[PDB]
Amino acid sequence: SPLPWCPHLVAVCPIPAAGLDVTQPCGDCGTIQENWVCLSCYQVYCGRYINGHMLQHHGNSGHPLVLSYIDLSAWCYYCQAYVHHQALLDVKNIAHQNKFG
């Protein structure tokens, strides 16, 4: 199981009314692969196995929680764990609808 809570959920911000684009490329390198969306500022950056731009974004912003456009899991960089909680349901559901129809 993911953690059912973490102390950084307070930093999850409202979903833009434009919604989410799960095909959006990395804002730095432009890769289509292994992207995440930041649940604070909604910038999109690639995962550790591509060029690590989301980890970089965490480092330079301190934003805690990011959502995978592969599997809709949410990672907290501070807790170094996956987290699931009702505060993430709306954003996960919006991503699921955009990804899968």
Instruction: Return binding residues for Zn(2+).
Output: 6, 8, 26, 29, 38, 41, 46, 53, 57, 63, 76, 79
**Is residue 75 near ligand EYV by the rule CB under 6 A?**
yes
**Is residue 72 near ligand EYV by the rule CB under 6 A?**
no
For the chain, report the end-to-end CA distance as a whole number of angstroms: 26
Question: Count of CB atoms within 10 A of residue 25's CB?
Answer: 15
Query: Which residues fall within 8 angstroms of residue 50, CB to CB, at 6 or more apart?
Result: 26, 29, 31, 33, 34
Interacting partner of 75 out of ligand EYV, Zn ion, none (Cβ under 5 to 8 A depending on kind): ligand EYV
Which residues of the chain form contacts with ligand EYV (CB under 6 A)?
A: 47-48, 54-55, 75
